[model samples]
Target: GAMEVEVKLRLLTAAAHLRLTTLLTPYHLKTLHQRNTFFDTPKNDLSLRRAVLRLRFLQNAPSPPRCIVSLKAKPTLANGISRVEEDEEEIEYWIGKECVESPAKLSDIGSRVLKRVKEEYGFNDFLGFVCLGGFENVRNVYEWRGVKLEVDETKYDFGNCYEIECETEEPERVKTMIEEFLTEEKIEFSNSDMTKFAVFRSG
Candidate 1:
């Protein structure tokens, strides 16, 4: 397991996009077209436990599809920052029921997959989960001052916004770096207590 450290800042304007691109112009930039499916027990029991389970279908521009399964530990917060631990696996076989022979149950077609997944992790109560909902987004990836960064422009049934994130095992270093960058760039942001799942659910 690896420590996943991250922060999200809302981007509500074109100028925000310009500032981000200009500030990170010297680094390597990557982009992704991603569709993510979130899962939980009928009444969001997994979320209540602070765990997040999901499948992501990510495709780089001009590339084929790749399927990934991920489960993340509940996030903890300190001084308005969120931190979580996560494990991810890439699946090589076909992913959906009708699309091909899949690991999920017939009723679960596009969800409830990987019997091996439950056996390996969260075996206690993993079998009861089902897909909640899904959404799509385009993400631009970059590295700034030794920390991994991504500027995600996302759209869902409810709303659309830009989410800027930073991830690293070295939390304090990245945290201090981002604080300095935000100050230097004179960017304004709000600390959000809501997750994408919550946001869409409310919508």
Candidate 2:
């Protein structure tokens, strides 16, 4: 059977104000320490079985003042979100085949790429990769956040540094429902994304 072109929401990336440097200024080092303890190596993410399953709407959130800053791509595997090369400020997302790669191939590349970038491009250690489930498309997204509702599912071990996601199944109805949820939460419309989405990372 052919895969239907169902425009399910793979809500990736959002207009967030994720500022770890300043937001975590008080305990940036501590945060790093905690991270070190949680993950030993760069790709030392917990086993997939322990990868913490979460619905797009049911995940922990960030603190106030810092705001939800911004979001990056949501990869099935934690290491999927990475800083490839010169591109630093602008985050990259891997969708379908063109952008994404196989796990084995990715692991091999991640090991070398991360080192090269750190030495050559001076890539710093950052927290990226919050899991997401689904796909998104342009049409599925709402042009304007008329009435927003965000889902509340998922989990992050060390908790969220500075991130918030307002994603849903790639459908007008689902996206609208998410808008309604956010509205129910009293979160300002400005912080929401009237777009089809999935996982959003903070890096």
Candidate 3:
């Protein structure tokens, strides 16, 4: 199909309340209390990004549970980019998933993986290597281009958040679509902050 869309992707990010609330035990929640936790855990090395996987029941509540994976590369932050943000070329599906295959009966693979990540890829950057089994939730992203003419939808989870994103034919036009709705709904929105958040839906 000689479509006319830009074929964009989403870099979804979310966080969990465990970092601020009393959900987890003190021992479990203790990790987030460190200033270094925002950068990189001492037990581990590397700078973590501001993103997480979140699962939310509230439609518009800002804080929620997050399930984010540690990547060899981090994503771009608000008004900034994480070390691994260079992977922008990836379609959301091929984002980042590390596959661990243990050959020996028990190669201490899990611990070894932690060592490698702590020493090698995203870990030193403070990114993490997920043990798998948790849930993740992101948010929504709609970007329109002037090509393709086809619509694409992708789903992603980060710990507790789930998101749906679309890349269409015109980015600016998608922005316009969002603006029109807010205007019609008499809802005030801001476009000043580069790292600002806007809740957009297809028009």
TM-score winner, 2 or 3: 3
CA displacement after TM-score superposition, residue 162 of candidate 2 (Å): 7.0
* Candidate 3 segments whose C-alpha is farther than 4 A from its true place: 1-39, 43-45, 48-74, 77-116, 119-170, 191-203
Candidates in order, TM-scores: namely 0.76, 0.20, 0.28
Each candidate's clash count: 0, 33, 47
Compared with the true structure, what per-residue lDDT tens digits does model 2 show for residues 58-167?
A: 11125211101121222231211111111111112231121122322222334333343235423344233323323221111122343222222222342222222323
What are the lDDT scores of the predictions, listed in order?
0.65, 0.25, 0.26
Please rank every candidate by lDDT, starting with the best: 1, 3, 2
TM-score winner among the candidates? 1
Where model 1 places Cα greater than 4 Å from the true spot, the runs are 12-14, 96-129
Residue-wise C-alpha lDDT for candidate 1, range 1-203, written one tens digit per residue:
46777775666565676687677777747889988777666767657777776677888864668877667766775543567777777764255312222223423433334443455444444445566767887888887767777877778886676667776666566666776776688765554466665666677
Clashes of 3: 47
What ranking of all candidate models by TM-score puts the best one first?
1, 3, 2
Across 1-203, the per-residue lDDT of candidate 3 in tens digits comes to 02222222222322222221222122221111100001134332333333322111212223432312222333333211112221111111111222222112112223332344445544332233322222212222222233221111122231222121223445466546544543574443333222111111110
